[PDB]
Amino acid sequence: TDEHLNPIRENLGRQWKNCARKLGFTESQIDEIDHDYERDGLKEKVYQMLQKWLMREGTKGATVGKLAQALHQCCRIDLLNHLIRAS
Amino acid sequence: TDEHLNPIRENLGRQWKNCARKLGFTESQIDEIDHDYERDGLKEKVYQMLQKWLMREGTKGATVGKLAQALHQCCRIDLLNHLIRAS
Amino acid sequence: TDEHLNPIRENLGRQWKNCARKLGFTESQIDEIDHDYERDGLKEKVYQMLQKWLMREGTKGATVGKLAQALHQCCRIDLLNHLIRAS
Amino acid sequence: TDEHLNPIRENLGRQWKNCARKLGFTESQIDEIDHDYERDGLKEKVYQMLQKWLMREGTKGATVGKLAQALHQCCRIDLLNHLIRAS
Amino acid sequence: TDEHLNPIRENLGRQWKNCARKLGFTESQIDEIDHDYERDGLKEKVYQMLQKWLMREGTKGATVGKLAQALHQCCRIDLLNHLIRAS
Amino acid sequence: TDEHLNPIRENLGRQWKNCARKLGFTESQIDEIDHDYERDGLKEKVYQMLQKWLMREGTKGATVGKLAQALHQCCRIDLLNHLIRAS
Amino acid sequence: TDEHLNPIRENLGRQWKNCARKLGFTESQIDEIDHDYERDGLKEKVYQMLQKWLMREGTKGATVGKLAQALHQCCRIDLLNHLIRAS
Amino acid sequence: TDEHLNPIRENLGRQWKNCARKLGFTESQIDEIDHDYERDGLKEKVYQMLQKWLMREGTKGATVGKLAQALHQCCRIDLLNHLIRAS
Amino acid sequence: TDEHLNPIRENLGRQWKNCARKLGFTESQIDEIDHDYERDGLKEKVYQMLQKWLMREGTKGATVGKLAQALHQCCRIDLLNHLIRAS
Amino acid sequence: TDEHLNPIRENLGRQWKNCARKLGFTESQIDEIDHDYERDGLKEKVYQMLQKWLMREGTKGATVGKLAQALHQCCRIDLLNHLIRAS
Amino acid sequence: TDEHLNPIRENLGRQWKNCARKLGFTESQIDEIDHDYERDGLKEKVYQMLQKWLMREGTKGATVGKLAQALHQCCRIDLLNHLIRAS
Amino acid sequence: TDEHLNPIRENLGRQWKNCARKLGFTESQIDEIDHDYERDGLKEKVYQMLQKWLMREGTKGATVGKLAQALHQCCRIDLLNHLIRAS
Amino acid sequence: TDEHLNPIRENLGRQWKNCARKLGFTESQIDEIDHDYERDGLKEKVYQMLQKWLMREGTKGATVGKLAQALHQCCRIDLLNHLIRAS
Amino acid sequence: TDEHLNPIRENLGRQWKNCARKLGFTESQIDEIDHDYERDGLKEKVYQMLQKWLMREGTKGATVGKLAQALHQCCRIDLLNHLIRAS
Amino acid sequence: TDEHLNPIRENLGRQWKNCARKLGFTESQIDEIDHDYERDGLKEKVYQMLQKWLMREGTKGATVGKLAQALHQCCRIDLLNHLIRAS
Amino acid sequence: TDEHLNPIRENLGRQWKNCARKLGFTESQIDEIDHDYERDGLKEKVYQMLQKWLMREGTKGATVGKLAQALHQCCRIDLLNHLIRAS
Amino acid sequence: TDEHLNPIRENLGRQWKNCARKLGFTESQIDEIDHDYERDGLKEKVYQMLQKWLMREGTKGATVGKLAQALHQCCRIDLLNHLIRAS
Amino acid sequence: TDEHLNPIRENLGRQWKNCARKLGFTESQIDEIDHDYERDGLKEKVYQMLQKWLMREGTKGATVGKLAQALHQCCRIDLLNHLIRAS
Amino acid sequence: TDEHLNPIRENLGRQWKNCARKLGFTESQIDEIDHDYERDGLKEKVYQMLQKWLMREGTKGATVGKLAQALHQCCRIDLLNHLIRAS
Amino acid sequence: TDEHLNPIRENLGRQWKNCARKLGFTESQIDEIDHDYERDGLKEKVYQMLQKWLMREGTKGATVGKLAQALHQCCRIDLLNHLIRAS
Amino acid sequence: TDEHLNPIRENLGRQWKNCARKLGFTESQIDEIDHDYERDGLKEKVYQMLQKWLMREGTKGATVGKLAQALHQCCRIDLLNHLIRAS
Amino acid sequence: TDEHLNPIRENLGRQWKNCARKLGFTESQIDEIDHDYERDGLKEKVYQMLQKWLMREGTKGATVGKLAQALHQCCRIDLLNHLIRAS
Amino acid sequence: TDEHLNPIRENLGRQWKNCARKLGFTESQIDEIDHDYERDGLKEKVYQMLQKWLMREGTKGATVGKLAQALHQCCRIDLLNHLIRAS
């Protein structure tokens, strides 16, 4: 949902390549995200990384469990931990 | 049907060339879609790509299975996954 | 018959030159259809293309098999595939 | 009426294919409108799209409700929303 | 009657070939109407198409029901729908 | 008069359908003008549109005020504005 | 109004994708705006984003409150805050 | 005059949509200019934009003052500033 | 002469509207050439533009000097420069 | 004389209606020429237009000056300019 | 002969005006062919162009050499090249 | 032959201008192909480019060697290399 | 104002991250400023930090008091203390 | 003049954003220059910045004094100081 | 084949310019690929680089040996080494 | 000649705007080349820039000396230096 | 919270590597913090060490107890002891 | 594999230049890794060093033996020694 | 002022930590000065200590009295005593 | 030649700015190379620096002597010394 | 000149911050030089410091006297003393 | 393990060079440890000496026996003797 | 060679400044090596000193004799004496 993903889009930041690697993105896909949205900035790169993960996983794969696991390996567990448990 | 294809037409977007390649379009056909409907925009290009796939496949080939496979290879499984399973 | 040809006349559209070429029309015949019925529109051009194919082939050549083959090469198999098999 | 349709004819513009699709036009009919009135311009194409919708629907179908629904799906609700409610 | 047919004669226009085809005219009859009254214009062609339909059908066939059906298939239902129901 | 109408006939051009619609021509009348004088060109179509407006309005309706209003709605006010006020 | 929207069109700039996302645009619509008006520049993209928001919302939705909320979430509150309160 | 408008036609260029918006063109009119003269190029689009402004304004509105104001808001004041004051 | 005009007819091309404007054609005359000979193509439009210039100017005006000046302003000086000086 | 009128009869062509209008023919007279000699072709229509001008003007009105003026307004000055001055 | 001219009549097509110009037809003669046989179509126009060339040239001028030269300048050398050399 | 040219017509695509330039087409001829068949699309432009090359070269020039050389310079050697050598 | 902010933009320097943190910027926003304007340098990063603070706060929040407090916590009170009190 | 501006265009470089800010460009205008001409490089961005300054200022504002002041504030006084005083 | 080239298209990425240089592309060709497909992204650029290599080399040059050599010099031997030997 | 210009057309590339500026193209002409041939790519833009320079200069201006000077100022002297002196 | 962590960020200082080791940072993570933020200084390194600890631990691990234990082992108990107990 | 390389990517750290030198990277390649991924940090540099080693060596060279030898010379044998033998 | 602070910057030396402590610097700030400017030397550390004192105190706190008191407690009264009283 | 320049392109590295300065590049040209090819990396910057030197010098200036002198001043004499003398 | 500044650029070294301070650089400008060119090294920082001094001072301020004074205060008088007086 | 090495890291102290020599460190490695971590202190030097011993020895060499022998020769047997036997 | 230089790189150590001075490095070059590679350590400084000596001397100067002389003056003759004579 939009509320379940807005904090991740807004507060992920410079570690988007690591998060993408933990989310199953190949190096070529990270290169495409880095290249296509260079003109729009880092916020666009993070948004498009999350969006392309959603498109790739559909509704069956875009689960909270897999996102939580990916963020835990990425060490960015603050995002989902705050968003879901605090709210 | 119209309900089975409206979300794909409306939400496919910038990846229409990749989806067309996964749907069996030759490079010349993609060039024709890109050239003929440049004056109408990206929405028209996506609509005409889906429409020409339907004309090419008839009713025997325009099956949900082949569209699902093509979207899975295109990595745009969110479209059909949301449309069919969520609704 | 009229029922076997009305959907093709009504839903063929902008690809009438390609369909005519796959139906055995020479370039001069396509020029004559394009020139004579410019004042009546695209619907008249498509109708006259089908009608002139019928006159040229008689009843021995105006078969479902040859029309199906011509539409398959034209990639407009949706027309006959829907009309004959769906109905 | 003429006053209920003049703003739609004058201010619809480049989205006439989408509006026609939401109004029930088949792809062949859109091709005929695009082909026949290419020599007169976009204004003629929009005018003829609205006019052919009126002819197809008669007086029983050319209702404000169906036009409003079609414009809402087309996302061009500004036309009818301004014309009817503002005036 | 004259009042039941004057609006159709006056407001039918460029779609007279399609209306004639839906009214049962063979292609040769449409050719004769197009050829004989080329010197008088489109209004004469439309008038003679309606008149020849009346002569062919007599009083037993020149019914409102068949004309309404033919106009509905021709998509020109505005003519009879306005004339009969509005007045 | 001839001097009050020659610049309009000579310099109206491609917008003759819009001007005819603003002058009270029905769609069928525009179709007849477009069809009858296709063999003579656009200049003949414009001349016959103005001439048929004059015949329809007589001398009581063929006034400068109504022509000025029709040209203003058509956005072709340059014609009459230059002709009458400049000369 | 034109005065209520000119400063937003002129001074929004590189954050148009974020503003569009906060205004309810789907990713496909942002792709269409980015693709269609690439030949005209960033100013055209911003203008068309605002214009398409106006068309989508009509007069009932194109309110100052919703635009203010969208700009506040986009963090571009300077636009409307200066325009409305300063003037 | 021709000398007062030739430099504007020749040297306006890619900013023709902005200049048209500052000259009072609605979005639909800009769409018609962009669509009709796509086959002739940008020079034709600029020429037709200026020409349609002249037709719309007549001789009473096609004044140097309004053109100067429109160019000043468009930020293309070099055109008229050079043409009129330098020569 | 035929030899003095064949290279201009054969090699003028897409810039025929600009050349016609530099040759003294009004916008209505260019509209008539564009409309009448749409069915024959661009070669016919260029041929008829040159031919109508010859008819308008007679033998007293159809001079090499005026054609050279018109081509120089049109920037198509290659035509006459090659034809006359090279041969 | 026959030599002073043969080139005009032979080389006037498709602009005979415009030349007739510039020669003082009413619209009804042009209709009669167009209708009576439809079976003989365009050459007969042009010949009869010139002949009826001669009959109407007698020998006092069938002067070179008035024909030259009429051709100049018709823009077909090539005819008389070549015939009289070149020979 | 009939065999030496049937392929040219059948396969010449839309370039009949250019071929007529290369065959020595004046513009008025092309206008007469275009006007007289508009009711019969393009095939009749091409047939009558060839026939009138034969009548004009007699048997002394209707030679293979001049027809070959005219087709070579017209760029339609496929007609005679195939007909004479292939057969 | 048809089999020797169908793959080139079907799979040439966006590089048709370059292929035409390598095939000896002047810029005006490319402009005519681009302008005349804009209403039919890119497939028609490619088909007409090949067809006009065939007409220009006859049977003596439409050789495999010259087409192979032209495709080699155009860098589209895949077309003929696959068609002739693979089959 | 420009004079109230130019010294801060020009003389803030290496402590821009600390100043941004004291101004309410999240870590992701600082990452975006650091990433987007790496190609332009430190001056651009400082300018964009101040500019984005202004956009975020509007005119109601971009007060001297809050900027003074933020600079005092950042320990860069020399900037505003010199600018406002000295001048 | 071209000589008074070529050294500034050629030797301004990476400080074009600062120079544009000192020349009166708003942040949105700098964003448009940065976005539109990203595909052409830094030289194009600098050229278009100077060109748009010239268009905005006309001939009355594009003075040496204002450019010198803007370069002095930008600290790029070497450009104009060398160009004007050294030469 | 498609299976022999899909991994290279999908996993080549940011080093496409180096791979193109090792594949024999001139700098202008790399510029054309970079410019034409900027609107579609890096994936399209890589796909079109491989496709244009295939067109340039035909079936005689598009060999596994030359691709392997080019990838070895490019240092991207993982692509072909994994694809061919692992599978 | 074709051999004197083919290497320049093939190997000029991304610097076509700079070369056009050094060749005397106004900014509007560069805008027209960039806009008209966006659908065909960079190769078409370079080809049309050279072609329009040739048309503008005729045979008297399209000299090797002026092209060499323009390339020297553009810093692309490799093109002509290699082509003329090496061959 | 911000108040519970500001004194630790501001007053930790040169012992940040020891504190990071007591907080569970691997040597590679300390190397990344030391390397990435060398350009910003020691304050940035300390801030990013605390921030990355917060991201790693989420809200479940970023407890006062674990921070107190880590500071006690680091021997920097003054920070938290003063902050929490004194205030 | 991913499990055979994740500990090396995560725990290599500041000695990446030495490890790259022992892995066969030239000084220029180390410069490119250091320069390209300066904006992403040390983790990205280490990841890209390992990734580029994998691409360079393919599957035939990316063996455990060579990596073990390179780590032994680099003195970072803890990485592979722990990963492979401990697990 | 610069003259009131140059002798202190130049002649303070090894006692900069003591002077900073007497000037109100916390231990963390002294650590940051010692760490950040280790690469530039002791002169840079002293300069940055004085500069950061100036930034912290603004113009209201950077008084001669407080500096004199701080130097007196630091026992470095020679600096200010010589500078102010001797000069 | 390619063999005389490949080692310089491959092994020049981080000193490309110094080498460019010794090769006669102005600071603006180095800024353009640094800015345009930031998205492709250091290898692209070095390649484009060498390529632009070749374009600037042509074949008359791109001599081994000048490159050797430039590398000697740059202190990178290993490149050319190894390449030419060792091989 | 280049010879008057090369020894200063090459032999200034670690004291570039002190020299910049004596040359009138503010602390923010030194921060920008230190930050922007950290990726290129100390040589680039020294070169850019001298270059920015030249740009700031123009030709009127970039005098030998002021540079000599700045170096004398910086205590680096060896540079200019050797360069100018020894040579 | 961490518990088997924490007392050695915490209580080794000033004899770290002797312990490193007994642990197999070359003099250059001791110089690197002394130089790199001079800014962090003696604790960092001892920690990095132990850590680099662990990396060098892996898990096969980082045994208790070799550490005990090295400490016995170093005469610091109190560390391991207390840690292992006392606990 | 690599074997002739690895022991010198690995075992030179803290005396790298003295060795660089004996190898002909100016003080500025030693400052650049000390400054650029401070983030990587002493091993990187020694490696880059040797590497830059190799680049400066090429293959003609990077002789064993000069390195032996430089090491003898540096008093580090153990390096080369052991490496060359012992092995």
Short mmCIF file of N, CA and C in Angstrom, two decimals, chain U residues 3-87:
data_model
loop_
_atom_site.label_atom_id
_atom_site.label_comp_id
_atom_site.label_asym_id
_atom_site.label_seq_id
_atom_site.Cartn_x
_atom_site.Cartn_y
_atom_site.Cartn_z
N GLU U 3 53.88 30.85 -19.12
CA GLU U 3 55.23 30.70 -18.59
C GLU U 3 55.40 31.41 -17.26
N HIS U 4 54.62 32.47 -17.02
CA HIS U 4 54.71 33.19 -15.76
C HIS U 4 53.96 32.50 -14.63
N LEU U 5 53.21 31.44 -14.93
CA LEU U 5 52.38 30.79 -13.93
C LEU U 5 52.61 29.30 -13.82
N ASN U 6 53.27 28.68 -14.79
CA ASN U 6 53.53 27.24 -14.70
C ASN U 6 54.39 26.87 -13.50
N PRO U 7 55.51 27.55 -13.21
CA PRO U 7 56.26 27.17 -12.00
C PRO U 7 55.47 27.32 -10.71
N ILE U 8 54.60 28.33 -10.62
CA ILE U 8 53.78 28.48 -9.42
C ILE U 8 52.79 27.34 -9.30
N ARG U 9 52.18 26.94 -10.41
CA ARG U 9 51.25 25.81 -10.38
C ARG U 9 51.96 24.52 -10.02
N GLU U 10 53.17 24.32 -10.55
CA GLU U 10 53.86 23.05 -10.38
C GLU U 10 54.54 22.92 -9.03
N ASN U 11 54.99 24.03 -8.44
CA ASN U 11 55.85 23.96 -7.26
C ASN U 11 55.26 24.65 -6.04
N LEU U 12 53.94 24.84 -5.98
CA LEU U 12 53.41 25.51 -4.81
C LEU U 12 53.14 24.53 -3.68
N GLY U 13 52.33 23.50 -3.94
CA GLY U 13 52.23 22.38 -3.03
C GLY U 13 51.30 22.53 -1.85
N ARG U 14 51.76 22.06 -0.69
CA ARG U 14 50.91 21.89 0.48
C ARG U 14 50.43 23.21 1.08
N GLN U 15 51.07 24.33 0.74
CA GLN U 15 50.73 25.63 1.30
C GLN U 15 49.69 26.37 0.47
N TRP U 16 48.85 25.64 -0.27
CA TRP U 16 47.91 26.31 -1.16
C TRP U 16 46.82 27.03 -0.40
N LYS U 17 46.42 26.52 0.77
CA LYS U 17 45.41 27.22 1.56
C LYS U 17 45.94 28.55 2.06
N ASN U 18 47.18 28.58 2.56
CA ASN U 18 47.77 29.83 3.00
C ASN U 18 47.93 30.81 1.84
N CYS U 19 48.39 30.32 0.68
CA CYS U 19 48.53 31.20 -0.47
C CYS U 19 47.18 31.75 -0.91
N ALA U 20 46.14 30.91 -0.88
CA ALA U 20 44.81 31.37 -1.24
C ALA U 20 44.30 32.43 -0.28
N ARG U 21 44.56 32.24 1.02
CA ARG U 21 44.15 33.24 1.99
C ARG U 21 44.87 34.56 1.76
N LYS U 22 46.16 34.50 1.42
CA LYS U 22 46.89 35.73 1.11
C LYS U 22 46.47 36.33 -0.22
N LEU U 23 45.82 35.56 -1.09
CA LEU U 23 45.37 36.04 -2.39
C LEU U 23 43.95 36.58 -2.36
N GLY U 24 43.31 36.61 -1.20
CA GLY U 24 41.98 37.18 -1.08
C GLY U 24 40.84 36.19 -1.13
N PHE U 25 41.11 34.90 -1.07
CA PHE U 25 40.04 33.90 -1.08
C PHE U 25 39.36 33.85 0.28
N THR U 26 38.04 33.86 0.27
CA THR U 26 37.31 33.64 1.51
C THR U 26 37.40 32.18 1.91
N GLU U 27 37.02 31.90 3.16
CA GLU U 27 37.10 30.53 3.65
C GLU U 27 36.16 29.61 2.89
N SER U 28 35.00 30.12 2.48
CA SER U 28 34.07 29.32 1.71
C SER U 28 34.65 28.93 0.35
N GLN U 29 35.36 29.85 -0.30
CA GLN U 29 35.97 29.54 -1.59
C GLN U 29 37.05 28.47 -1.45
N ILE U 30 37.84 28.54 -0.38
CA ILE U 30 38.83 27.51 -0.12
C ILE U 30 38.15 26.18 0.16
N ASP U 31 37.02 26.20 0.86
CA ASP U 31 36.26 24.98 1.09
C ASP U 31 35.75 24.39 -0.23
N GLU U 32 35.28 25.24 -1.14
CA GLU U 32 34.80 24.75 -2.43
C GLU U 32 35.94 24.15 -3.24
N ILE U 33 37.11 24.79 -3.24
CA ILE U 33 38.24 24.22 -3.97
C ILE U 33 38.66 22.89 -3.35
N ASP U 34 38.67 22.82 -2.02
CA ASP U 34 39.07 21.59 -1.33
C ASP U 34 38.08 20.47 -1.57
N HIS U 35 36.80 20.80 -1.71
CA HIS U 35 35.75 19.79 -1.81
C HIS U 35 35.57 19.32 -3.25
N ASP U 36 35.50 20.26 -4.20
CA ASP U 36 35.20 19.90 -5.58
C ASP U 36 36.29 19.04 -6.19
N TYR U 37 37.56 19.38 -5.95
CA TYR U 37 38.68 18.72 -6.59
C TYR U 37 39.42 17.77 -5.65
N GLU U 38 38.70 17.20 -4.68
CA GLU U 38 39.28 16.16 -3.84
C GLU U 38 39.55 14.90 -4.65
N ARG U 39 38.72 14.63 -5.65
CA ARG U 39 38.86 13.44 -6.47
C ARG U 39 40.03 13.51 -7.44
N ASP U 40 40.58 14.70 -7.69
CA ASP U 40 41.67 14.85 -8.64
C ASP U 40 43.03 15.05 -7.99
N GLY U 41 43.07 15.54 -6.77
CA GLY U 41 44.30 15.58 -6.00
C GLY U 41 44.72 16.99 -5.64
N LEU U 42 45.94 17.10 -5.13
CA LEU U 42 46.46 18.38 -4.69
C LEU U 42 46.88 19.25 -5.87
N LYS U 43 47.40 18.64 -6.93
CA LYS U 43 47.80 19.40 -8.10
C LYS U 43 46.61 20.12 -8.71
N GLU U 44 45.47 19.45 -8.78
CA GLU U 44 44.26 20.08 -9.30
C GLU U 44 43.79 21.20 -8.38
N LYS U 45 43.89 21.02 -7.07
CA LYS U 45 43.49 22.07 -6.15
C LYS U 45 44.34 23.32 -6.33
N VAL U 46 45.66 23.14 -6.46
CA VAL U 46 46.54 24.28 -6.66
C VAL U 46 46.26 24.96 -8.00
N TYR U 47 46.09 24.15 -9.06
CA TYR U 47 45.80 24.72 -10.37
C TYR U 47 44.51 25.52 -10.34
N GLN U 48 43.47 24.98 -9.71
CA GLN U 48 42.19 25.67 -9.68
C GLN U 48 42.23 26.89 -8.78
N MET U 49 43.03 26.87 -7.72
CA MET U 49 43.19 28.07 -6.92
C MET U 49 43.80 29.20 -7.74
N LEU U 50 44.89 28.92 -8.45
CA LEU U 50 45.48 29.95 -9.31
C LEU U 50 44.52 30.39 -10.40
N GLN U 51 43.82 29.43 -11.02
CA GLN U 51 42.91 29.76 -12.10
C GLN U 51 41.76 30.64 -11.62
N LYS U 52 41.20 30.32 -10.45
CA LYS U 52 40.10 31.13 -9.93
C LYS U 52 40.58 32.50 -9.49
N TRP U 53 41.82 32.61 -9.02
CA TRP U 53 42.38 33.93 -8.78
C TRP U 53 42.45 34.73 -10.07
N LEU U 54 42.88 34.09 -11.16
CA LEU U 54 42.95 34.79 -12.44
C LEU U 54 41.58 35.23 -12.91
N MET U 55 40.58 34.35 -12.81
CA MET U 55 39.22 34.73 -13.21
C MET U 55 38.70 35.88 -12.36
N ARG U 56 38.93 35.82 -11.04
CA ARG U 56 38.43 36.87 -10.17
C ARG U 56 39.08 38.21 -10.48
N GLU U 57 40.38 38.22 -10.74
CA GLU U 57 41.10 39.47 -10.94
C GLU U 57 41.08 39.98 -12.38
N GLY U 58 40.67 39.16 -13.34
CA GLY U 58 40.70 39.65 -14.70
C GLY U 58 42.13 39.87 -15.17
N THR U 59 42.27 40.78 -16.13
CA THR U 59 43.61 41.17 -16.57
C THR U 59 44.10 42.41 -15.84
N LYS U 60 43.19 43.18 -15.24
CA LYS U 60 43.60 44.38 -14.51
C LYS U 60 44.18 44.03 -13.14
N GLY U 61 43.73 42.94 -12.53
CA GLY U 61 44.19 42.58 -11.21
C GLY U 61 45.25 41.50 -11.20
N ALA U 62 45.23 40.62 -12.20
CA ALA U 62 46.22 39.55 -12.30
C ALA U 62 47.56 40.15 -12.74
N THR U 63 48.12 40.96 -11.86
CA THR U 63 49.40 41.61 -12.10
C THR U 63 50.51 40.88 -11.36
N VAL U 64 51.74 41.08 -11.82
CA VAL U 64 52.89 40.49 -11.16
C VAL U 64 53.08 41.08 -9.77
N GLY U 65 52.77 42.36 -9.59
CA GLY U 65 52.98 42.98 -8.29
C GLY U 65 52.14 42.37 -7.19
N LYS U 66 50.85 42.17 -7.47
CA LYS U 66 49.97 41.61 -6.45
C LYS U 66 50.30 40.15 -6.16
N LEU U 67 50.64 39.38 -7.19
CA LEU U 67 51.07 38.00 -6.96
C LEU U 67 52.35 37.95 -6.15
N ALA U 68 53.30 38.85 -6.43
CA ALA U 68 54.53 38.90 -5.67
C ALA U 68 54.27 39.25 -4.21
N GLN U 69 53.38 40.22 -3.97
CA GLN U 69 53.04 40.58 -2.60
C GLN U 69 52.38 39.41 -1.87
N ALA U 70 51.45 38.73 -2.54
CA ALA U 70 50.76 37.60 -1.93
C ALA U 70 51.73 36.47 -1.61
N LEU U 71 52.66 36.19 -2.51
CA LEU U 71 53.66 35.16 -2.25
C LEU U 71 54.61 35.58 -1.14
N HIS U 72 54.95 36.86 -1.06
CA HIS U 72 55.82 37.32 0.01
C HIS U 72 55.16 37.16 1.37
N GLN U 73 53.88 37.51 1.49
CA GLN U 73 53.18 37.29 2.75
C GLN U 73 53.01 35.80 3.04
N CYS U 74 52.77 34.99 2.02
CA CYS U 74 52.68 33.55 2.16
C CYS U 74 54.01 32.89 2.48
N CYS U 75 55.12 33.63 2.37
CA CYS U 75 56.49 33.17 2.55
C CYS U 75 56.95 32.25 1.43
N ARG U 76 56.16 32.07 0.38
CA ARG U 76 56.58 31.30 -0.79
C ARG U 76 57.14 32.20 -1.88
N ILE U 77 58.10 33.07 -1.52
CA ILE U 77 58.67 33.97 -2.51
C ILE U 77 59.65 33.27 -3.44
N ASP U 78 60.03 32.03 -3.13
CA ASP U 78 60.95 31.30 -4.00
C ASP U 78 60.36 31.11 -5.38
N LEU U 79 59.06 30.83 -5.46
CA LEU U 79 58.39 30.56 -6.72
C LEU U 79 58.61 31.69 -7.71
N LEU U 80 58.07 32.86 -7.40
CA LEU U 80 58.13 33.97 -8.34
C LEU U 80 59.53 34.54 -8.42
N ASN U 81 60.26 34.56 -7.29
CA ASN U 81 61.62 35.08 -7.30
C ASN U 81 62.51 34.29 -8.25
N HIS U 82 62.43 32.96 -8.22
CA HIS U 82 63.20 32.16 -9.15
C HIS U 82 62.68 32.34 -10.57
N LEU U 83 61.36 32.20 -10.76
CA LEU U 83 60.82 32.19 -12.12
C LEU U 83 61.15 33.48 -12.87
N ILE U 84 60.87 34.63 -12.27
CA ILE U 84 60.96 35.88 -13.01
C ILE U 84 62.40 36.37 -13.06
N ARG U 85 63.07 36.44 -11.91
CA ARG U 85 64.41 37.00 -11.88
C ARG U 85 65.47 36.04 -12.42
N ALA U 86 65.36 34.74 -12.16
CA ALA U 86 66.37 33.81 -12.64
C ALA U 86 66.28 33.62 -14.15
N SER U 87 65.07 33.57 -14.69
CA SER U 87 64.88 33.38 -16.13
C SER U 87 64.77 34.72 -16.85
#
